[PDB]
């Protein structure tokens, strides 16, 4: 059992503090290795330059080509792969243009049948992909 | 349970409820005191004195006849031993085990039992130093402890 003494506060507090490091989420948040490894570096979004269009194969139970883009982030020169969500939206992206990319929704984890992809394109050339998809706006010329 | 064994024995003395002197016992308190003095002069520890008085002279409990315990009587008369008899016997047992281990170096069981004995010695000596029964500088060293025996 655990100690129950009026003078065990140091023991209890210290044991809790040592045992909190075996919490995966607590350790990931407080160790600093995950923040260093994060390409966004703690940001919610990041602007990058599209290097090439890459087609990502959906995982084995499904079958599709997930149209992604490799982008290089302006802030730190890191190369990530970002999903271009809707259909025909890869046609809205050219090569060597600026795109705003956000997380994919799992806080750094891959989503669905898209291996190794944890980012999605939000804007292209300072125009949202939703506006171009719905026809509300057109990419600049 | 035992301090140094997995034993959970229950065997011990069971004092009777009555604290009075037995009706059969005709020795005066001073008579028991002189018998205690004689037995101490013979060279006996208070436990041995109590055992002899119980077995032969019918003194069921010295504390109930004389109103005092055997060690207190020995101290008050001035013939109590230098160090308490439990610690003395623990040191004697340690000395015996060390003498055996000197000529039997492959006896790991003897070494383990010596460790237990010296731990008991140290605990008792610390308790006695707390009660000012032993001088605060007293220490059990296994180099000339046979002289203490």
């Amino acid at each position: 059992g655990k100690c129950r003494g009026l003078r065990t506060a140091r023991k209890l507090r210290s044991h809790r503090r040592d045992q909190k490091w075996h919490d995966k989420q607590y350790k990931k948040a407080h160790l600093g290795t995950a923040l260093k490894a994060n390409p966004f570096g703690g940001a919610s979004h990041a602007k990058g330059i599209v290097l090439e269009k890459v087609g990502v194969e959906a995982k084995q139970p499904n079958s599709a080509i997930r149209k992604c883009v490799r982008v290089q982030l302006i802030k730190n020169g890191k190369k990530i792969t970002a999903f271009v969500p809707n259909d025909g939206c890869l046609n809205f992206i050219e090569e060597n243009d600026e795109v705003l990319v956000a997380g994919f929704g799992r806080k750094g984890h891959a989503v669905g049948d898209i291996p190794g992809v944890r980012f999605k394109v939000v804007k292209v050339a300072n125009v949202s992909l939703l506006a171009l998809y719905k026809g509300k706006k057109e990419r600049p010329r | 349970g035992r301090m140094h064994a997995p034993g959970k024995g229950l065997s011990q003395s069971a004092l009777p409820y009555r604290r009075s002197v037995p009706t059969w016992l005709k020795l005066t308190s001073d008579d028991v005191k002189e018998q205690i003095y004689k037995l101490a002069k013979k060279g006996l520890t208070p436990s041995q004195i109590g055992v002899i008085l119980r077995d032969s002279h019918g003194v069921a409990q010295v504390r109930f006849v004389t109103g005092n315990k055997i060690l207190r009587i020995l101290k008050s008369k001035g013939l109590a031993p230098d160090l308490p008899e439990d610690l003395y016997h623990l040191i004697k047992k340690a000395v015996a085990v060390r003498k055996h281990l000197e000529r039997n170096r492959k006896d790991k069981d003897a070494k383990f039992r010596l460790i237990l004995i010296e731990s008991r010695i140290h605990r008792l000596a610390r308790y006695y130093k707390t009660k000012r029964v032993l001088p605060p500088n007293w220490k059990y060293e296994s180099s000339t402890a046979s002289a203490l025996v």
Partner: protein
Amino acid sequence: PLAKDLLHPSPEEEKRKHKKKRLVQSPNSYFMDVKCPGCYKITTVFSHAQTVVLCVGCSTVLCQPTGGKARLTEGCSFRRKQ
């Protein structure tokens, strides 16, 4: 089962128990006055004696220590006290 109760007698259930586990603990031993046929005086001996006691006027072995209750010699008449 309804402890310390006079309605159901239990001398027999109390002296059967362990001496320490009784309602009020009490020894299972006793002191006994011993006459030796060759002697002429009382000797009060503990039942569970650990000493080879001798007659106070002679050199006769009154009793010998055993694992429990001491073993008395033949002919010595022993009677418990109290």
